[PDB]
Amino acid sequence: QSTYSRQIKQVEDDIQQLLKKINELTGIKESDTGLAPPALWDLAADKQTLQSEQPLQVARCTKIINADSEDPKYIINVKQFAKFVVDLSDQVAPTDIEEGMRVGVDRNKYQIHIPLPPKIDPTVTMMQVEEKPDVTYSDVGGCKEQIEKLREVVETPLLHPERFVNLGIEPPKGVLLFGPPGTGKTLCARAVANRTDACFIRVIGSELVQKYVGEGARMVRELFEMARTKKACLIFFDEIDAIGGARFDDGAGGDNEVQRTMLELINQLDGFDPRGNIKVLMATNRPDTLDPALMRPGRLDRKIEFSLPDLEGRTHIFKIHARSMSVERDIRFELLARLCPNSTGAEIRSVCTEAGMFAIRARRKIATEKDFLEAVNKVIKSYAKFSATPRYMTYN
Amino acid sequence: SRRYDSRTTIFSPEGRLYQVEYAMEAIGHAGTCLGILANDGVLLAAERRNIHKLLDEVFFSEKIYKLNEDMACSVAGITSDANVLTNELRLIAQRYLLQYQEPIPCEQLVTALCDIKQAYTQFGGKRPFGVSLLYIGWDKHYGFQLYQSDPSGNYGGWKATCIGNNSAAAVSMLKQDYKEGEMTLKSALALAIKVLNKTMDVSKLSAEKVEIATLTRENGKTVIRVLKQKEVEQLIKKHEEEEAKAEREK
Amino acid sequence: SYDRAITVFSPDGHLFQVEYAQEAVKKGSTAVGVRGRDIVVLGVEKKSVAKLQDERTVRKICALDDNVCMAFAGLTADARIVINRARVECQSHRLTVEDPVTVEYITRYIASLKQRYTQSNGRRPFGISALIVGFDFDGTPRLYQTDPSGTYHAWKANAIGRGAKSVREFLEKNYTDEAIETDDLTIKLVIKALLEVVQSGGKNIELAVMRRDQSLKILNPEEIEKYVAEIEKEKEENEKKKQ
Amino acid sequence: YDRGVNTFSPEGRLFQVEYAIEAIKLGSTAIGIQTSEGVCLAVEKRITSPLMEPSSIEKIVEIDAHIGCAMSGLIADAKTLIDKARVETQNHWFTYNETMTVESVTQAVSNLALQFGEEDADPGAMSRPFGVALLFGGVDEKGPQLFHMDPSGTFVQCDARAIGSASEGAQSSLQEVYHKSMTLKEAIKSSLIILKQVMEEKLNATNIELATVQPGQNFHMFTKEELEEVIKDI
Amino acid sequence: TQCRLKLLKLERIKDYLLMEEEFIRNQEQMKPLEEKQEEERSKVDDLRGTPMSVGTLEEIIDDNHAIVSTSVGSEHYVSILSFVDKDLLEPGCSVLLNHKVHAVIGVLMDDTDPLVTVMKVEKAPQETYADIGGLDNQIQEIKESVELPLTHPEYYEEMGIKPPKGVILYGPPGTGKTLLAKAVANQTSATFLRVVGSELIQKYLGDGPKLVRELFRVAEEHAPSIVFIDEIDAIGTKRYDSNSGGEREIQRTMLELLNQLDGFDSRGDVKVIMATNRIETLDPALIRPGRIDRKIEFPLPDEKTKKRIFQIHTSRMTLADDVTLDDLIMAKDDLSGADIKAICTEAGLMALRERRMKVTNEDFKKSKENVLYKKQEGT
Ligand SMILES: Nc1ncnc2c1ncn2[C@@H]1O[C@H](COP(=O)(O)OP(=O)(O)OP(=O)(O)O)[C@@H](O)[C@H]1O
Ligand SMILES: Nc1ncnc2c1ncn2[C@@H]1O[C@H](COP(=O)(O)OP(=O)(O)OP(=O)(O)O)[C@@H](O)[C@H]1O
Ligand SMILES: [Mg+2]
Ligand SMILES: [Mg+2]
């Protein structure tokens, strides 16, 4: 098409003129911004130089000598690691800054000025905060007591706290999820993670194993310091077996490091510490290993088992995963569930993939009744040779 | 108790029997031991695994046992287990003689042992017998034979085989040089010194480092003699005079 | 002594020992079996010979009785222990009942010997599968197949051991009554099926036929090379249906 | 990680026995309906090829001329039970001279159900529970009766049971279609309707076994001809 | 066609933009617009100042202030200045502070990772499939698990089914697991990370989970990526003493891999390929369906296949005429495509001791006899 081949010439070349002139009248690159609004920012930065208190050198209060006296004094401990007796703020009321509180001072005359933003210590812990994943409570089958237990103790007390205080009770804090691998301990938590709409802070069991003695325990400590401030959190200790251990002595200090971190976790959900109002999920798959003092009610009040689904469940779960793909008219999903023995929810995810594959491998546009019986043969029989469920099911 | 049980009679996830499989590797360390069939008799060659200046020899052979009047065998593996299997063989072969009043057929003697080696891998929870054997023999249904049993309980006839240290290297050398038929007992001893010389890393063999025992038929009775040091020393000189005349091409 | 429980139930509801013995079959050699109307042909693939072994001691097709033969695929060790007890049984039955064993009955006893071993103390399962083949007291052909579990079904055709899933896929389409109408067509059906899972031609397929009331003949290597020439001749006269 | 063969679950019941129950859910389907006219047993063969003879599969076996049986689960383990049943019923006929009540036979078979024992027994006892559930249906002096016997030794009389890989599904469709006033021809037709939904391949004359046991007859398995006649009606 | 009917409107958008910028530059200071911008940019290098001190952003205060840590480690509550993309200010990031005023002029630099130079590879692996002889099932599931979903993402979407997530290649050593890895690294032109399973054990405690964390992160930054783990057995079988806590620390390393392979953190478009030859010694939960979906197995080659392999390495050579390929193949048995290439390589070398280019039937006899003692000795 000479007409439309000619159109294609200047459809590339003219859009390239567009970009050319865009750059001729904006121009960006390895430059820090888009440079479009910050040109005026520049003229506010000339007011940031006049801002002479800035820079402000940051320290921490450690000891107030006088408070009732006309002249409060403080003992600042700065970052050059020399300590100063200092005056009070030049305006901020001397009621605000107690000892411990991290506080910024001026660098010339170490005059305390601006209270912080304490507990810097949270640097790794910072990153455990979450940004809502993409699974909802319909995408989960076997909706028996399973998911109605969990909502009851973790979601309902945060949406309707009036009905638990009118009765005069106090709902339970923690909830242990445990089951054979691939039965929706995480899925059921990916679920509550977004729908809850309250601060959600999941730590990965292994990320609390640190290098230096009692740094692990510090990690835990900082984690609850941060969660007590944010009023009403969840903490979701995923796959705790690391730092999930059980006390024991033998030989040369076996696991004495990891073990001590656990004692700190234990200690902050049961010590004296009343603690704010933070719920806690723990999803293992090996509950047999958890220390008894970590497991008993008042730290993990409700234990939810995720047993393998039954016939009725399976039938449900096939619908949850297959409904999304194109299938011929009449698939006996109830026959693919008689045909499954004790299967994980994650085994059935895999079946549907392969029924799709044979349809793709053979170039057809629709999976048939045959394609499942065939893909259900492949994924269960063969691959069941090396399954988790057999062995991993006693630790459950 | 159950904690201290090894469970030696049980399958692997893969479809093996680990103890019988390890027992093979224990045989790959024993002395080399090869056997060659001919038309005019058959012969076992084995290298003395233990040799030393102080060590003595009292017995006609330190690896060849006579199981009968008509059969001998050589062992390879755990020497201790070999004193057990060779005593049951002798007792089997007399218990055959006590019924049928004949010398026992070559094949049967082996299977009758391989029911005992095979039992141990299937129940009882003892460790298996870590031995493989070569049986040279003579019977009136097949003439000379050679056989090889494993700790599994598998046996086979062979016309020329090897078991124990560097077995696969011997067998590669036999596949090439051994003729189907056309073997005299003179020629087999040439092949047996040549194969043994290649799987052992010594510069040359010595009449005091090997043991060659033949099994011949002379006058309707069987004879099983072990070559003295002089008879083997001849064979070693005639092989060096075939390496001196295996450079006449350049 | 050594009263332990080797085979116990999984938590998934299997028996891992009898499922692991299933793998000791799959590491075996292919054997097939088709039954004609006057002739039953079972062939074992691979003599396993290395130009040094005898073909008289590597045989995998033994004969329980006179009308009953059996091919196996698994651990050669175990198979010889079953075959023995089977041969005893085959004579114990001639003593107490005048007729010779039927082919169902010597099977139900091989199977029932393998089932007891997966439910007794001390013992691991027998790691063999079997094709029991024979003729009844009525000239009828029969083909039975066991496995470590100790179950047994009859077949019209069947393959066990290595590469048996492929060979069953070839016998579904090729076993009709346009084949196995003659003694020459039934032998050619077996060979044509092992040629799909042997990678060295026909000079590697030991093949035994049994014919009505006569005893088991093992076909010497010459006759098998003649039959392999008729196969390869027939895949060049399928070029008259491609033109 | 290993334990005994005789360990209790801290829950409260025997590890193995709780497991051997799961081995049933792998097995074929059987349906037994008890009437005043007789007992019918229907069990699907579940052939796996077209090369198998749909006849050397036996999942209904005669125990005597008035006590049928249907196995689901590991059909290999039934071989030992069935043969104890027969030799039980015969011994009871050789001493007391008279048939045996169906209940008594099933009791005598259930006494083996718990009998494994890694040690402190013979070098011949079982090592593991039996992997098989039974449906003894017979006719004696109480009229027809049908018993269900699982690997727990707990046997119990039923008016209509289903076992196997469609125990859940079929059991619910029996509760809607069963009632005291039936005849034998209504039941054989009722069961094969339930058995036609829960199978995986089409219902031929080569995919089930029917048997019946009636007051005025023996145990009588239907042949391939007679089956054509009751699948025509459906 | 329509695309230029679209252009005719896109240009007008730009011509209008040109009206505004071309007039407002001359309304600004009778000069080009980039000349006014350059007046400003040089003036920003007056604000910016010289030098520029690198530091650490520790935390952000919403108020456009931030606590940074200079070289000394002394923290300063500074202000976030002009010309800074606040979306490039995450914790741990390197910032440019004023040497004198200490205020973040910004992260105007491409801070580098020295771990990506180890994990990523700018390869061109010569071996493509078609150089993998006679293992053809193996060659495909893979294409359905890795390469095909990147070439034709419309098949899986049209069917309505997620593409399968990860594969395990497992079999006897030598058969061709890593050779298939080379093949698919070549083709897909996704970023191809590669870490051996042993590298997941290092001296100091705790680094195991840390190295594992930062391997995925790398592969996430560069999505779409492939993460191959050659010989994942070595994590869980051979040990090295260096590590502390022994086997317990090995586990927590694995539990980390095991999470960040499935876990909670909504990842995407990172294929996984785990090779191994001991698969029976892997924590099942690791290879749980839905964590890894396809277990390709690599059996020893057939006889006719073993001939296509020995026919493929010899193709670049010149063989003497007395060489019978079929006599050397069957001569031995149970060969891996590694053993085949090892007999080819040796013999070709014997020809280079003689200064020829004809591998003779005897070069292969010496060779085959030096790879058999090789297989026989050192066992
Ligand atoms: N009840 C269920 N309904 C729907 N999908 C399920 C269910 N159970 C498991 N799955 C499927 O299994 C996949 C993985 O499950 P999940 O990872 O939550 O199991 P897990 O208990 O976290 O196992 P692991 O111990 O390996 O972390 C999910 O993505 C989901 O598709
Ligand atoms: N099937 C085959 N076809 C062609 N070449 C092969 C084949 N198998 C192996 N090779 C050759 O052997 C070489 C090494 O093999 P490869 O790296 O695949 O072994 P591997 O199976 O990964 O062993 P390991 O278990 O040690 O990882 C390859 O570079 C290739 O040239
Ligand atoms: Mg999880
Ligand atoms: Mg490799």
Side-chain angles (χ1 to χ4, degrees), chain A residues 139-142 180-187 239 285 317 321 345-346 349, chain E residues 262 288 291:
Chain A
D139 284 10
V140 193
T183 42
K185 312 174 294 293
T186 303
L187 180 64
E239 297 206 68
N285 27 71
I317 288 189
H321 291 344
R349 137 71 40 250
Chain E
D262 182 13
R288 173 210 87 190
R291 195 72 115 285

PDB file of all heavy atoms in Angstrom, chain A residues 139-142 180-187 239 285 317 321 345-346 349, chain E residues 262 288 291, ligand 1:
ATOM      1  N   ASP A 139     -11.623 -16.510  46.616  1.00  0.00           N
ATOM      2  CA  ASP A 139     -10.660 -17.352  45.925  1.00  0.00           C
ATOM      3  C   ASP A 139     -10.183 -18.518  46.770  1.00  0.00           C
ATOM      4  O   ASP A 139      -9.308 -19.261  46.318  1.00  0.00           O
ATOM      5  CB  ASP A 139      -9.462 -16.512  45.482  1.00  0.00           C
ATOM      6  CG  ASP A 139      -9.774 -15.650  44.278  1.00  0.00           C
ATOM      7  OD1 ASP A 139     -10.964 -15.560  43.905  1.00  0.00           O
ATOM      8  OD2 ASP A 139      -8.830 -15.063  43.706  1.00  0.00           O
ATOM      9  N   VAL A 140     -10.726 -18.697  47.970  1.00  0.00           N
ATOM     10  CA  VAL A 140     -10.328 -19.762  48.879  1.00  0.00           C
ATOM     11  C   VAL A 140     -11.521 -20.690  49.076  1.00  0.00           C
ATOM     12  O   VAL A 140     -12.636 -20.230  49.351  1.00  0.00           O
ATOM     13  CB  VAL A 140      -9.835 -19.180  50.219  1.00  0.00           C
ATOM     14  CG1 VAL A 140      -9.120 -20.237  51.051  1.00  0.00           C
ATOM     15  CG2 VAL A 140      -8.905 -17.992  49.972  1.00  0.00           C
ATOM     16  N   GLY A 141     -11.290 -21.995  48.912  1.00  0.00           N
ATOM     17  CA  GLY A 141     -12.302 -22.998  49.155  1.00  0.00           C
ATOM     18  C   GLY A 141     -12.115 -23.675  50.507  1.00  0.00           C
ATOM     19  O   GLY A 141     -11.259 -23.316  51.311  1.00  0.00           O
ATOM     20  N   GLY A 142     -12.946 -24.684  50.751  1.00  0.00           N
ATOM     21  CA  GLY A 142     -13.015 -25.265  52.077  1.00  0.00           C
ATOM     22  C   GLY A 142     -13.322 -24.196  53.109  1.00  0.00           C
ATOM     23  O   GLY A 142     -12.632 -24.074  54.126  1.00  0.00           O
ATOM     24  N   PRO A 180      -0.518 -29.382  56.222  1.00  0.00           N
ATOM     25  CA  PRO A 180       0.453 -29.898  55.266  1.00  0.00           C
ATOM     26  C   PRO A 180       0.756 -28.854  54.198  1.00  0.00           C
ATOM     27  O   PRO A 180      -0.086 -27.989  53.903  1.00  0.00           O
ATOM     28  CB  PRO A 180      -0.244 -31.129  54.677  1.00  0.00           C
ATOM     29  CG  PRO A 180      -1.249 -31.536  55.711  1.00  0.00           C
ATOM     30  CD  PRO A 180      -1.711 -30.243  56.312  1.00  0.00           C
ATOM     31  N   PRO A 181       1.952 -28.899  53.613  1.00  0.00           N
ATOM     32  CA  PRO A 181       2.330 -27.846  52.661  1.00  0.00           C
ATOM     33  C   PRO A 181       1.350 -27.756  51.505  1.00  0.00           C
ATOM     34  O   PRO A 181       0.995 -28.760  50.881  1.00  0.00           O
ATOM     35  CB  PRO A 181       3.726 -28.268  52.182  1.00  0.00           C
ATOM     36  CG  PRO A 181       4.100 -29.489  52.944  1.00  0.00           C
ATOM     37  CD  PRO A 181       3.115 -29.686  54.044  1.00  0.00           C
ATOM     38  N   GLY A 182       0.935 -26.528  51.217  1.00  0.00           N
ATOM     39  CA  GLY A 182       0.022 -26.263  50.131  1.00  0.00           C
ATOM     40  C   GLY A 182      -1.395 -26.606  50.519  1.00  0.00           C
ATOM     41  O   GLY A 182      -2.057 -27.390  49.843  1.00  0.00           O
ATOM     42  N   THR A 183      -1.881 -26.040  51.611  1.00  0.00           N
ATOM     43  CA  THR A 183      -3.282 -26.203  51.969  1.00  0.00           C
ATOM     44  C   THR A 183      -3.920 -24.866  52.314  1.00  0.00           C
ATOM     45  O   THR A 183      -5.012 -24.835  52.893  1.00  0.00           O
ATOM     46  CB  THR A 183      -3.424 -27.195  53.116  1.00  0.00           C
ATOM     47  OG1 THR A 183      -2.395 -26.949  54.085  1.00  0.00           O
ATOM     48  CG2 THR A 183      -3.289 -28.602  52.577  1.00  0.00           C
ATOM     49  N   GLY A 184      -3.262 -23.768  51.954  1.00  0.00           N
ATOM     50  CA  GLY A 184      -3.827 -22.454  52.144  1.00  0.00           C
ATOM     51  C   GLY A 184      -3.579 -21.840  53.499  1.00  0.00           C
ATOM     52  O   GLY A 184      -4.430 -21.089  53.989  1.00  0.00           O
ATOM     53  N   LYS A 185      -2.446 -22.139  54.135  1.00  0.00           N
ATOM     54  CA  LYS A 185      -2.086 -21.390  55.329  1.00  0.00           C
ATOM     55  C   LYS A 185      -1.653 -19.989  54.951  1.00  0.00           C
ATOM     56  O   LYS A 185      -2.013 -19.013  55.617  1.00  0.00           O
ATOM     57  CB  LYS A 185      -0.957 -22.069  56.087  1.00  0.00           C
ATOM     58  CG  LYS A 185      -1.137 -23.544  56.328  1.00  0.00           C
ATOM     59  CD  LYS A 185       0.115 -24.120  56.965  1.00  0.00           C
ATOM     60  CE  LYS A 185       1.325 -24.073  56.025  1.00  0.00           C
ATOM     61  NZ  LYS A 185       1.143 -24.969  54.860  1.00  0.00           N
ATOM     62  N   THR A 186      -0.859 -19.878  53.894  1.00  0.00           N
ATOM     63  CA  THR A 186      -0.490 -18.570  53.393  1.00  0.00           C
ATOM     64  C   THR A 186      -1.652 -17.962  52.614  1.00  0.00           C
ATOM     65  O   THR A 186      -2.007 -16.803  52.839  1.00  0.00           O
ATOM     66  CB  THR A 186       0.766 -18.681  52.526  1.00  0.00           C
ATOM     67  OG1 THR A 186       1.826 -19.265  53.295  1.00  0.00           O
ATOM     68  CG2 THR A 186       1.209 -17.320  52.025  1.00  0.00           C
ATOM     69  N   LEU A 187      -2.289 -18.739  51.734  1.00  0.00           N
ATOM     70  CA  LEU A 187      -3.395 -18.204  50.951  1.00  0.00           C
ATOM     71  C   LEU A 187      -4.443 -17.559  51.847  1.00  0.00           C
ATOM     72  O   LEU A 187      -4.846 -16.410  51.634  1.00  0.00           O
ATOM     73  CB  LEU A 187      -4.061 -19.300  50.112  1.00  0.00           C
ATOM     74  CG  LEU A 187      -5.210 -18.700  49.304  1.00  0.00           C
ATOM     75  CD1 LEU A 187      -4.636 -17.692  48.320  1.00  0.00           C
ATOM     76  CD2 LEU A 187      -6.028 -19.752  48.588  1.00  0.00           C
ATOM     77  N   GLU A 239       5.864 -18.986  58.322  1.00  0.00           N
ATOM     78  CA  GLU A 239       6.806 -20.107  58.333  1.00  0.00           C
ATOM     79  C   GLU A 239       7.854 -19.944  59.431  1.00  0.00           C
ATOM     80  O   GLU A 239       9.050 -19.797  59.168  1.00  0.00           O
ATOM     81  CB  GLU A 239       7.469 -20.274  56.958  1.00  0.00           C
ATOM     82  CG  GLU A 239       6.486 -20.622  55.836  1.00  0.00           C
ATOM     83  CD  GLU A 239       7.130 -21.369  54.688  1.00  0.00           C
ATOM     84  OE1 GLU A 239       7.542 -22.531  54.886  1.00  0.00           O
ATOM     85  OE2 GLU A 239       7.217 -20.796  53.582  1.00  0.00           O
ATOM     86  N   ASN A 285       4.190 -24.978  59.158  1.00  0.00           N
ATOM     87  CA  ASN A 285       3.634 -26.242  58.734  1.00  0.00           C
ATOM     88  C   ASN A 285       4.050 -27.356  59.673  1.00  0.00           C
ATOM     89  O   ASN A 285       3.484 -28.448  59.594  1.00  0.00           O
ATOM     90  CB  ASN A 285       4.055 -26.584  57.297  1.00  0.00           C
ATOM     91  CG  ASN A 285       5.380 -25.961  56.914  1.00  0.00           C
ATOM     92  OD1 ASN A 285       6.439 -26.371  57.391  1.00  0.00           O
ATOM     93  ND2 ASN A 285       5.330 -24.959  56.039  1.00  0.00           N
ATOM     94  N   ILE A 317     -13.076 -26.552  45.008  1.00  0.00           N
ATOM     95  CA  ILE A 317     -11.827 -25.913  44.593  1.00  0.00           C
ATOM     96  C   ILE A 317     -11.611 -26.013  43.085  1.00  0.00           C
ATOM     97  O   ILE A 317     -11.032 -25.103  42.476  1.00  0.00           O
ATOM     98  CB  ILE A 317     -10.631 -26.502  45.369  1.00  0.00           C
ATOM     99  CG1 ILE A 317     -10.672 -26.029  46.827  1.00  0.00           C
ATOM    100  CG2 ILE A 317      -9.299 -26.104  44.705  1.00  0.00           C
ATOM    101  CD1 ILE A 317      -9.425 -26.365  47.642  1.00  0.00           C
ATOM    102  N   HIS A 321     -10.745 -22.639  40.482  1.00  0.00           N
ATOM    103  CA  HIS A 321      -9.601 -22.464  39.594  1.00  0.00           C
ATOM    104  C   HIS A 321      -9.932 -22.659  38.124  1.00  0.00           C
ATOM    105  O   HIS A 321      -9.318 -22.013  37.271  1.00  0.00           O
ATOM    106  CB  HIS A 321      -8.483 -23.435  39.974  1.00  0.00           C
ATOM    107  CG  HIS A 321      -7.828 -23.121  41.280  1.00  0.00           C
ATOM    108  ND1 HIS A 321      -7.958 -21.898  41.903  1.00  0.00           N
ATOM    109  CD2 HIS A 321      -7.037 -23.871  42.082  1.00  0.00           C
ATOM    110  CE1 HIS A 321      -7.272 -21.905  43.031  1.00  0.00           C
ATOM    111  NE2 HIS A 321      -6.703 -23.091  43.165  1.00  0.00           N
ATOM    112  N   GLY A 345      -4.858 -28.511  48.170  1.00  0.00           N
ATOM    113  CA  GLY A 345      -5.401 -27.473  47.309  1.00  0.00           C
ATOM    114  C   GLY A 345      -4.448 -27.098  46.192  1.00  0.00           C
ATOM    115  O   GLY A 345      -4.871 -26.777  45.080  1.00  0.00           O
ATOM    116  N   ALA A 346      -3.140 -27.152  46.472  1.00  0.00           N
ATOM    117  CA  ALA A 346      -2.112 -26.805  45.498  1.00  0.00           C
ATOM    118  C   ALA A 346      -1.835 -27.923  44.500  1.00  0.00           C
ATOM    119  O   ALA A 346      -1.207 -27.672  43.467  1.00  0.00           O
ATOM    120  CB  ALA A 346      -0.807 -26.440  46.206  1.00  0.00           C
ATOM    121  N   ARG A 349      -4.600 -26.857  41.896  1.00  0.00           N
ATOM    122  CA  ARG A 349      -4.095 -25.778  41.058  1.00  0.00           C
ATOM    123  C   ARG A 349      -3.273 -26.345  39.906  1.00  0.00           C
ATOM    124  O   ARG A 349      -3.438 -25.937  38.754  1.00  0.00           O
ATOM    125  CB  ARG A 349      -3.265 -24.798  41.899  1.00  0.00           C
ATOM    126  CG  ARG A 349      -1.939 -24.296  41.284  1.00  0.00           C
ATOM    127  CD  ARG A 349      -2.130 -23.335  40.114  1.00  0.00           C
ATOM    128  NE  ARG A 349      -3.229 -22.397  40.340  1.00  0.00           N
ATOM    129  CZ  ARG A 349      -4.391 -22.409  39.689  1.00  0.00           C
ATOM    130  NH1 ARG A 349      -4.635 -23.307  38.742  1.00  0.00           N
ATOM    131  NH2 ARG A 349      -5.319 -21.506  39.980  1.00  0.00           N
TER     132      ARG A 349
ATOM    133  N   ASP E 262       7.707 -19.108  46.880  1.00  0.00           N
ATOM    134  CA  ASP E 262       6.246 -18.979  46.877  1.00  0.00           C
ATOM    135  C   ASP E 262       5.776 -17.818  47.748  1.00  0.00           C
ATOM    136  O   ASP E 262       5.390 -16.758  47.245  1.00  0.00           O
ATOM    137  CB  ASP E 262       5.572 -20.261  47.358  1.00  0.00           C
ATOM    138  CG  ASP E 262       4.065 -20.180  47.320  1.00  0.00           C
ATOM    139  OD1 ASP E 262       3.527 -19.241  46.693  1.00  0.00           O
ATOM    140  OD2 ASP E 262       3.422 -21.105  47.854  1.00  0.00           O
ATOM    141  N   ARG E 288       7.111 -28.832  46.162  1.00  0.00           N
ATOM    142  CA  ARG E 288       5.664 -29.043  46.286  1.00  0.00           C
ATOM    143  C   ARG E 288       4.934 -28.488  45.062  1.00  0.00           C
ATOM    144  O   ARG E 288       5.172 -27.332  44.683  1.00  0.00           O
ATOM    145  CB  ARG E 288       5.156 -28.356  47.562  1.00  0.00           C
ATOM    146  CG  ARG E 288       3.636 -28.340  47.771  1.00  0.00           C
ATOM    147  CD  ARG E 288       3.233 -27.105  48.558  1.00  0.00           C
ATOM    148  NE  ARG E 288       3.022 -25.969  47.670  1.00  0.00           N
ATOM    149  CZ  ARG E 288       2.850 -24.713  48.073  1.00  0.00           C
ATOM    150  NH1 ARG E 288       2.868 -24.412  49.366  1.00  0.00           N
ATOM    151  NH2 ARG E 288       2.667 -23.755  47.172  1.00  0.00           N
ATOM    152  N   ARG E 291       4.803 -24.803  43.837  1.00  0.00           N
ATOM    153  CA  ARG E 291       6.093 -24.179  44.090  1.00  0.00           C
ATOM    154  C   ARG E 291       7.025 -24.420  42.922  1.00  0.00           C
ATOM    155  O   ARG E 291       7.663 -23.496  42.408  1.00  0.00           O
ATOM    156  CB  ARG E 291       6.712 -24.786  45.356  1.00  0.00           C
ATOM    157  CG  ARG E 291       7.860 -24.011  45.946  1.00  0.00           C
ATOM    158  CD  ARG E 291       7.287 -22.790  46.552  1.00  0.00           C
ATOM    159  NE  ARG E 291       7.403 -22.656  48.010  1.00  0.00           N
ATOM    160  CZ  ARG E 291       6.686 -23.313  48.928  1.00  0.00           C
ATOM    161  NH1 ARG E 291       5.791 -24.239  48.609  1.00  0.00           N
ATOM    162  NH2 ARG E 291       6.888 -23.043  50.208  1.00  0.00           N
TER     163      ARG E 291
HETATM  164  N1  LIG F   1      -8.485 -24.038  49.909  1.00  0.00           N
HETATM  165  C1  LIG F   1      -7.916 -23.566  48.783  1.00  0.00           C
HETATM  166  N2  LIG F   1      -8.608 -22.898  47.836  1.00  0.00           N
HETATM  167  C2  LIG F   1      -8.042 -22.428  46.712  1.00  0.00           C
HETATM  168  N3  LIG F   1      -6.734 -22.602  46.476  1.00  0.00           N
HETATM  169  C3  LIG F   1      -5.930 -23.256  47.340  1.00  0.00           C
HETATM  170  C4  LIG F   1      -6.484 -23.783  48.570  1.00  0.00           C
HETATM  171  N4  LIG F   1      -5.484 -24.372  49.232  1.00  0.00           N
HETATM  172  C5  LIG F   1      -4.357 -24.235  48.494  1.00  0.00           C
HETATM  173  N5  LIG F   1      -4.643 -23.558  47.369  1.00  0.00           N
HETATM  174  C6  LIG F   1      -3.688 -23.216  46.298  1.00  0.00           C
HETATM  175  O1  LIG F   1      -2.373 -23.557  46.735  1.00  0.00           O
HETATM  176  C7  LIG F   1      -1.491 -22.486  46.415  1.00  0.00           C
HETATM  177  C8  LIG F   1      -0.405 -22.358  47.456  1.00  0.00           C
HETATM  178  O2  LIG F   1      -1.007 -22.472  48.736  1.00  0.00           O
HETATM  179  P1  LIG F   1      -0.241 -21.869  50.004  1.00  0.00           P
HETATM  180  O3  LIG F   1       1.118 -21.438  49.527  1.00  0.00           O
HETATM  181  O4  LIG F   1      -1.102 -20.855  50.712  1.00  0.00           O
HETATM  182  O5  LIG F   1      -0.062 -23.175  50.915  1.00  0.00           O
HETATM  183  P2  LIG F   1       0.831 -23.016  52.233  1.00  0.00           P
HETATM  184  O6  LIG F   1       0.022 -23.596  53.367  1.00  0.00           O
HETATM  185  O7  LIG F   1       1.240 -21.569  52.271  1.00  0.00           O
HETATM  186  O8  LIG F   1       2.100 -23.955  51.872  1.00  0.00           O
HETATM  187  P3  LIG F   1       3.656 -23.680  52.253  1.00  0.00           P
HETATM  188  O9  LIG F   1       3.845 -24.350  53.590  1.00  0.00           O
HETATM  189  O10 LIG F   1       4.422 -24.369  51.139  1.00  0.00           O
HETATM  190  O11 LIG F   1       3.860 -22.185  52.325  1.00  0.00           O
HETATM  191  C9  LIG F   1      -2.329 -21.224  46.378  1.00  0.00           C
HETATM  192  O12 LIG F   1      -1.792 -20.285  45.443  1.00  0.00           O
HETATM  193  C10 LIG F   1      -3.704 -21.725  45.988  1.00  0.00           C
HETATM  194  O13 LIG F   1      -3.975 -21.512  44.597  1.00  0.00           O
END
